[PDB]
Each structure stands twice: as structure tokens, then as C-alpha cells.
A paper describes a structure:
Among them, miniature single-domain antibodies derived from the variable region of the heavy chain-only antibodies of camelids have gained relevance due to their high therapeutic potential and the robust techniques employed to generate them. The usefulness of VHHs relies on their ability to specifically recognize antigens with high affinity despite their small size. The kinetic parameters of the interaction between the VHH antibody termed D3-L11 and its antigen HEL were determined by surface plasmon resonance (SPR) analysis at 25 °C. The values of the association rate constant (kon = 6.1 ± 1.6 × 106 M−1 s−1) and dissociation rate constant (koff = 7.9 ± 1.7 × 10−4 s−1) were determined as described in the methods section, resulting in a dissociation constant in the sub-nanomolar range (KD = 0.13 ± 0.04 nM).
To analyze the contribution of the side chains of each residue at the binding interface, first the crystal structure of the D3-L11·HEL complex was determined at 1.65 Å resolution. The root mean square deviation (RMSD) value between Cα atoms of VHH and between Cα atoms of HEL in each crystal structure as calculated with COOT28 was 0.49 Å and 0.54 Å, respectively. It is observed that the CDR3 region of D3-L11 protruded into a cleft of HEL, comprising 68% of the buried surface area of the binding interface (491 Å2 of a total of 719 Å2) with high complementarity (Sc = 0.78). Collectively, the interaction between D3-L11 and HEL is strongly dependent on the enthalpic component suggesting that non-covalent interactions drive the recognition of the antigen by D3-L11. Based on the mutagenesis analysis, residues Y52, Y102 and P104 were identified as hot-spot residues bearing a large influence in binding (>100-fold loss of affinity) and therefore resulting in a large energetic contribution (ΔΔG > 2.7 kcal mol−1). Of the three hot-spots residues identified in D3-L11, two of them are located in the CDR3 and one in the CDR2. These three residues are clustered together in the three-dimensional structure, and uniformly surrounded by a constellation of residues of lesser but still appreciable importance for binding the antigen. The results presented herein demonstrated that hot-spot residues coalescing on a small geometric region are characteristic not only when interacting with the planar surface of antigens such as in Fvs, but can also occur in a VHH recognizing a concave surface of the antigen. Because the long CDR3 covers the surface that emerges in the absence of the VL domain of IgGs, diversity in this loop is fully employed to generate a preorganized interface on the convex surface of the VHH. This organization is suitable to recognize concave surface of antigens, complementing the more common mechanism of protrusion of CDR observed in other VHHs.
Author numbering:
A (entry chain B): 1 to 129
B (entry chain A): 2 to 126
Amino acid sequence: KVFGRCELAAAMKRHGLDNYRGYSLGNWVCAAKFESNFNTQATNRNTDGSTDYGILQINSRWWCNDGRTPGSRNLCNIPCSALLSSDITASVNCAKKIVSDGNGMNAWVAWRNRCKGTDVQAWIRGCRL
Amino acid sequence: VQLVESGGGSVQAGGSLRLSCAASGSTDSIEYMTWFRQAPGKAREGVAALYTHTGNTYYTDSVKGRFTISQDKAKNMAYLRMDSVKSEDTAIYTCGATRKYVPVRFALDQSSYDYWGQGTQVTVS
Ligand SMILES: [Cl-]
Ligand code: NA
Ligand code: NA
Ligand code: NA
């Protein structure tokens, strides 16, 4: 599924992400845009054997299990395949754990590079939320 | 990513020594820069980790209060200042880094790190 910007903003709001660990809704929409271009099926293989999954590009070295990295961790206690669903719940629930780890949204590289220090509220402007 | 260590060598007990690590390539993709050490008879252990995008720091119990990890992010530099050094600090010190986030609970584990410097001997008298 490729979400529309405003469609995703609404779904993220419904999932309680607005102001979650202090990050306004625009931050979350912007992160999805640059991490996955709003695509719930997005995957990216990394040099360590791990894979980034789904709309928020969550890494299998730490957060989910895909079997392909023996001794890796699964801190969200889910199969990585759950992060490729057309509904965002599993990704959002896992993302909540990630952002609560102690370094905020900096754990998302594309958020740091493309969202942090920008007018993130632009990503939700003009949506009827 | 190449990590280039400098500093080290001999130091007296209760004294101070600064180690430096300079990171190759662009500043932006480095996540953690973290000093490890390996002492006579023991495995490599995490000493002090720094998350470069917030400045947050994490120390092993045996150095809390005596060692300080810090950075100059613009230069891809990380520093370890050892104050109040003790015999147990004698070890080979190596800086590691990652280009992907690592949960804080694993930030002092060597298996978390993908890039390493040379090792720099520190000896406490
Ligand atoms: Cl949904
Ligand atoms: Na990611
Ligand atoms: Na895993
Ligand atoms: Na870099």
C-alpha cells in the first residue's frame, strides 16, 4: 500500500502518534515520506545482513525477527513480516518502542536527514484531521 | 568507515589521559562512537558510548564518575578523558562506531559495532 500524505496523517493521528514522546504529528508523516515514500511494502537490505521493513523502515537487527540474522534481537516481539501490512498498527506499536529507547526520533536516519530542523508541520498542513 | 585513534601510552595512578578518535567520511551517518578496552586476561568490554546525534552518554559501572566521553561532531571526533585513572584501566583501548541505531541496552556490547580503530595501549603506573 502506498498511503497518501493526508490519509497517513489521519491514520497516524488515530494511532496516538501526535506529540508521542514530544514529537508532533508532522514529524511522523515526514519520517514515513523519507524512509519509505509512504510505501508499507518497502524493504532495504543492509550490509550487516539485516533488513529495514515497512513504512517506518524498522531494522531486523534489533526490533523484529526474520530468521536471517542468528543472535539478532527482536525487541518489538514480532515477525518482521508484520511490519509489511497495509495497516500500520504493528509498525506504529514498534515505532513507539523505538522512539522511547532514549534518543528520540534520531533512530530514523531519513528523519534526521530530511525532517529534523525543518518545518515539519508542513507535512500535515491542508489535511482535514 | 576508518577510525583513527591518537593519544595513549603511559600514565600514573590518580592521573589523567585523553584519547582521541577521528572518524572517516561524512559526519551524518555515524550513530554511536564508543570506546572499548581489553585488559590482560579479560575479553573486550564496552567502556563509554556516545550517541552522536543527541550527545547522550553511557558508561560501564567501573569507570562511572572517572571517565568522560565527549565529541566535536562537526569533525567526526570523539574523545575519552580518563580522570582518577587506576590499575584496572590498563588495557588496549579501541574506538568503535556504527552507521545504524543500536538500542541503548546494547550500546556497550562489542557485537553492536561494525567499524573499529587500531587499539591504543594505555598503561597505569
Ligand atoms: Cl491503518
Ligand atoms: Na530505519
Ligand atoms: Na531480529
Ligand atoms: Na557518514
